[PDB]
Design a protein around this nucleic acid. Sequence first.
DNA 1: CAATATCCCGAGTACATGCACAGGATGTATATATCTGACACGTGCCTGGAGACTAGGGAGTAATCCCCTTGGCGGTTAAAACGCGGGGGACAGCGCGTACGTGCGTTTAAGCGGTGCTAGAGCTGTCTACGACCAATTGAGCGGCCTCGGCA
Length: 412
Amino acid sequence: PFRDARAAPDPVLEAGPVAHGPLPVPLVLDNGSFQVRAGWACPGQDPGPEPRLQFRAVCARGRGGARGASGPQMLRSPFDRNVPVNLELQELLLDYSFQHLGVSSQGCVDHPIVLTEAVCNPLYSRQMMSELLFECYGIPKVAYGIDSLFSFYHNKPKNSMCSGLIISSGYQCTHVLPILEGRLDAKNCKRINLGGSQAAGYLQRLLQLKYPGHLAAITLSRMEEILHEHSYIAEDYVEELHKWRCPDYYENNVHKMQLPFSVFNLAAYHQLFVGTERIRAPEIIFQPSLIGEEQAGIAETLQYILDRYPKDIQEMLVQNVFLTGGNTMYPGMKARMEKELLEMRPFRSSFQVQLASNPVLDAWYGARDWALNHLDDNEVWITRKEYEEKGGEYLKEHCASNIYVPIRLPKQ
DNA sequence: CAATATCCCGAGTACATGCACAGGATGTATATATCTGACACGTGCCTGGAGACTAGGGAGTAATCCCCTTGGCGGTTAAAACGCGGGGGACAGCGCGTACGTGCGTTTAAGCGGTGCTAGAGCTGTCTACGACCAATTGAGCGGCCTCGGCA
Ligand SMILES: Nc1ncnc2c1ncn2[C@@H]1O[C@H](COP(=O)(O)OP(=O)(O)O)[C@@H](O)[C@H]1O
């Protein structure tokens, strides 16, 4: 039976939890598309004690017009396909986050910040995100990095130079990232235009067509439960669906999702039987052709990037296949990935598949551990004055960050 | 002549209508405007006129029986009228849509310069289609040979 989600927690703090040693403790801000995750670096403690503000990245303002609201509670959100592209709907998302974390007082946030961004970020987008940050909030110095690569940095066996493929899958994108000597080989990195949002959207539209008698009973927040709790990824889809074909297996494995009641009441207050549907929603990232979409999918793409290298460095970078982010949470994901990988390697060769320690939070914990180390490496950060000579389309090439290129944007 | 029916006249009957009222949105009122197109001017075409001639058609007639037209036909139901059934008719309320208002932002119109699409050109330059004629076919009717039924 379905549950309902929680809302409106009580995060309130003093003006700044400044510890011993250096006073400018940075904010660690994972600016996610599904949800934002934000908090103080809190140095000198091994386990990250409190990743506060776990909240959905969505805002309310309706037919009333005169007000808007920002916490977990018609709706809007600041992103287009995992790049932020909104003005004040970004501000009132930052404002919520700062106010609930506490801030000093004066006409700026006194603390430096580390902020996640898109695997590639359009130059205009980076420029705007820098302007909307330095101008309005007055931050002293800033760092941009990629969610996935922070999660890798967290999960590495050692704080040392590495190579691998990162497999990442968030709200509206999945990416395959080849990395060599700690550097993202962004020349031949690739992404797929699908993700967990689109899975839920498909599972919704399926069950709407299965039970037209009660369109209103099924809605995204209930699709979330069946997709998180009750769905799994096949080892081989055309074989799973084949064992699902016989009634004696079906009845033993179909999921009985009881709606809340007011004929045994199921003619409207149905038990929403999900069978094959609990496979067809996860599978979208491996076979986007279950939707209309003609793209290679996470299987053909991995082969298509992996055959663009010399045969020795393939055998190097496949030694660390890493799973992180959103959709990798499905049960069975490691097994499907390592089976699909076994067919596309030399007959006796070796590979290894690692799953992130906490697939959803390790991006933030990574950004924490990174900033807490690189406090004083002033070649890594963008300082407030640099933004006055370099127009905002500028970045500092540390590991776990997008590849910079010399370029400039006309503005007046 | 009797009977069912339509017509006609006066009592008694809700509300419909015509009115008065407040007030609001728009019709007026003035000044300005360019430009539609009025008007004026020739250009050049066809609408018309005007002849000579054949041949196609039209008009006429003649004969006539097909078709219409009529009477009288025989056969069966729409109408008449009644009994008889249920169904169209008159109140209580829910809330869903429609409207309407707000702020939603998509697109068009305009004016910009460049340029290639189309629509008037040809004797284009032929040659599909247009007569012109020939040939095949079927069908129908008229002679001609031959078994049999009713009559000497
Ligand atoms: N436990 C889970 N099982 C399955 N899917 C999950 C789970 N938790 C989150 N998701 C999916 O993860 C996606 C969001 O992941 P996230 O890393 O926050 O995205 P991003 O970094 O792009 O904002 C959502 O589409 C959601 O459906």
